[PDB]
């Protein structure tokens, strides 16, 4: 069996070829032991603090909420080394790999952010890193590809399937099934086979823990709701985790609505997909009526995971967390608004979370509410995307 429950209600599991089970079992055992090891926690804390830059600020956004009864704070993961929350968990996973005596790292990446995060962690900790990326993604993310290579990582294009994230995910697993003896698979989100959903949550948990301590210090109470975008679910569960037992705190996950849910061109499997079994887990996903896996569309490349973390599907099913969607245009508007009113350029991914917060505020201007938006990353990387769009509109 396993040490921890691989399921969150009906979602999760370990749907990988038999050959990979020993790898998952080893990882789970190493994780459980690491969690009880004061030395591991100390090293991880050291890296988070002195290398990554934790704790991150909790910024009160006074301008954007003017004229309303909403008080909005932004958890600044955009200020974390690397420019996104991904850095937190790759550092923990890299340490786990070393705890298991592994010297190589395998990672998958779509937009390229996880690839960059995996590469920097591997460079710092002396791990040989090889990254799999969809061919179409390699072509469209030249900047991130060059960054990975500058940091010594090996970038491998994947031309199979749709040549995107899910395809890179497959290639990663194919490789690991034959090299797990010396290589660790650094999965990029709170999804995939157990123990990844659990490990990634625990290695992103400081986001929520810090937010709780900071909001209590600044406001003397917990927020009415914490809001986060949901691509795969890591930054969201990272923010949610420490508040799960604080029943008065709303947990709101925001999936990308793309051109609009009714257009079929979106990335909201949790609320508009259908439960299936893929990427080693049972979870809602983007799939055809026949069961073939489809891609997730969003103006934001980072919210392209065609499925969603099992724990999110679970929290939704029991009504502990609520999930909504935000379209390309709503995210773009939030992006423009934060730049102009707070002088912060948010990642288009994070802009989805901000957009919903803005909607909560604008739809009910006189409702007194204390909101925290997880600003998962910075958007310097999205200025061209936003630029091209705006110009094409006159």
């Amino acid at each position: 069996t396993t040490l921890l429950n691989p399921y969150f209600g009906e979602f999760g599991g370990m749907y990988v070829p038999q050959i990979l089970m020993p790898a998952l079992n080893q990882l789970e055992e190493a994780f459980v032991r690491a969690q009880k090891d004061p030395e591991f926690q100390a090293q991880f804390a050291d890296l988070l603090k002195n290398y990554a830059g934790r704790p991150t600020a909790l910024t009160k956004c006074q301008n954007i909420t003017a004229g309303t009864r909403t008080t909005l704070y932004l958890k600044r993961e955009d200020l974390l080394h690397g420019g996104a929350h991904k850095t937190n968990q790759v550092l923990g996973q890299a340490l786990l790999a070393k705890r298991m005596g592994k010297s190589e790292i395998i990672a998958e990446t779509g937009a390229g952010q996880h690839g960059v995060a995996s590469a920097l962690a591997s460079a710092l900790l002396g791990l040989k890193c090889r990254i799999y990326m969809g061919a179409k993604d390699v072509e469209r993310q030249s900047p991130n590809v060059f960054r990975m290579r500058l940091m010594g990582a090996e970038v491998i294009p994947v031309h199979s399937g749709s040549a995107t994230l899910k395809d890179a995910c497959n290639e990663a697993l194919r490789d690991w099934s034959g090299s797990y003896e010396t290589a660790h698979y650094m999965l990029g989100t709170a999804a995939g086979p157990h123990p990844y959903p659990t490990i990634v949550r625990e290695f992103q948990r400081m986001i929520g823990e810090e937010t709780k301590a900071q909001i209590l210090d600044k406001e003397g109470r917990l927020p009415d709701a914490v809001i986060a975008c949901v691509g795969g679910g890591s930054n969201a569960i990272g923010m949610f985790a420490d508040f799960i037992n604080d029943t008065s705190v709303g947990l709101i996950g925001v999936e990308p609505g793309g051109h609009g849910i009714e257009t079929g061109e979106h990335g909201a499997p949790l609320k508009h997909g259908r439960v299936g079994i893929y990427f080693g887990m049972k979870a809602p996903m983007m799939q055809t009526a026949d069961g073939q896996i489809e891609e997730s569309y969003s103006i934001s490349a980072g919210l392209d995971f065609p499925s969603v973390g099992p724990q999110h599907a679970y929290l939704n099913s029991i009504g502990r967390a609520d999930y909504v969607s935000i379209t390309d245009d709503e995210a773009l508007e939030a992006f423009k608004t934060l730049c102009r009113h707070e002088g912060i350029i948010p990642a288009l991914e994070s802009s989805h979370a901000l957009a919903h917060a803005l909607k909560m505020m604008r739809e009910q201007p006189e409702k007194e509410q204390l909101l925290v938006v997880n600003l998962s990353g910075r958007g310097d990387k999205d200025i061209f995307t936003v630029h091209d769009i705006l110009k094409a509109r006159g």
Partner: protein, 258 residues
């Protein structure tokens, strides 16, 4: 299940192993695929392992990755695969037919319903590539309810516990992995000790000497996929030559099992 029992019983009386080729249904097209399958059988195939085209075959190497892609280029769907399976069964009443599936295609319209469809079409076994014994319960139960053999995988590092599980849960045949990775001796004795279904070695089997070695080691037979699929891929422009090569390869591999 039934058909595998009879096959192995017959093969045993003739002191020979089984040669089981694998091919993706609908590759490179439905018509050509049906011809390929009839060629494989006529050439000596004792049983068949047939894959249903899937968007993300995360347990297959490039060769089979392309087989799925060619099948998709032909618009091959799971429904058409079941139509093909019914026909194959109507043409060949005794040959064991095993499907190579990925979990989502089995789970899609209901696990029980999938195995029910397998039974009405004449399928004998189903191997779900991404379902380890740990997650097998619903699948093996549905399989057994519809007289379908649930195929379990015995990896090269399999410990005693796994061997015992594979031995008690499996039916039809035990899949003996030749190695780790994707498609492209002591355990055999342990499996027999635990009354496991006859072992069929698979992965990397591409030559007659490998088939003879498998049988010598105590395996009931050997499975070959990529080697078969490569022949299809290299002769796409020449359908007739494709069948010719397939027949020559299958007859060679089968002869080695005698």
């Amino acid at each position: 299940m039934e058909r595998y029992e009879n096959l192995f019983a017959q093969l045993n009386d003739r002191r020979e192993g089984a040669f089981v080729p694998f091919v993706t249904l609908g590759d490179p097209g439905i018509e050509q695929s049906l011809k390929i399958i009839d060629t494989l059988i006529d050439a000596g195939a004792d049983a068949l392992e047939l894959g249903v085209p899937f968007s993300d075959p995360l347990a297959d190497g490039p060769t089979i990755q392309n087989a799925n892609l060619r099948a998709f280029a032909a618009g091959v769907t799971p429904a058409q695969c079941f139509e093909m399976l019914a026909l194959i069964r109507e043409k060949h009443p005794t040959i064991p037919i095993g499907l190579l599936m990925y979990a989502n295609l089995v789970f899609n319209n209901g696990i029980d319903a999938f195995y029910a469809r397998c039974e009405q079409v004449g399928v004998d076994s189903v191997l779900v590539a991404d379902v380890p014994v740990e997650e097998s319960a619903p699948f093996r139960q549905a399989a057994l309810r519809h007289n379908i053999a649930p195929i379990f995988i015995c990896p090269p590092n399999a410990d005693d516990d796994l061997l015992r599980q594979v031995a008690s849960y499996g039916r039809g045949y035990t899949y003996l992995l030749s190695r780790s990775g994707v498609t492209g001796h002591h355990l055999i004795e342990k499996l027999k000790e635990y009354h496991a279904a006859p072992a069929l070695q698979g992965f990397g089997i591409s030559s007659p000497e490998q088939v003879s070695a498998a049988v010598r080691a105590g395996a009931a037979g050997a499975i070959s996929g990529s080697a078969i699929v490569k022949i299809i891929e290299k002769n796409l422009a020449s359908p007739k030559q494709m069948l010719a090569e397939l027949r020559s390869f299958v007859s060679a591999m089968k002869a080695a099992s005698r």
